[PDB]
Amino acid sequence: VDWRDEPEPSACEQVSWFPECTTEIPDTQEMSDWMVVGKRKMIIEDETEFCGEELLHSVLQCKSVFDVLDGEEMRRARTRANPYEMIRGVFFLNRAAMKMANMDFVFDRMFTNPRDSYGKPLVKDREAELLYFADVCAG
């Protein structure tokens, strides 16, 4: 695997979206048979329905190369190899806060300043309205 043919590390991130869902929202009658119960599968190597077999086997092999390695040796190499590792948490309690800071920039402040379909802010700091949010599995 030639890893040296990687694009120069950048603070500029690109977003590709799914198309806009043109189908109706599935109802209770449409979904009535959608829940298939089968044998408990604990195999990931044959899950090729949405990824080419050669890429799936290659990423699984590249993961399992680390199973024989000391975790502190892996962690030290990773800290040198990741161009973004010096960001960390800055002044926040952990590096997860910086993921939300990054994504709230990349997604046009849609979380910290959400908008209606006409592009108007749903919360104005001078009016009696609060930005309600939830944070789950988030300790």
Add this chain to the structure above:
RNA sequence: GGACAUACAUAAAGACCAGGC
């Protein structure tokens, strides 16, 4: 995937003996 034991303290006790006023 830090200390002045500034604890001045070796003072045996006990005894007899010698001298001082």
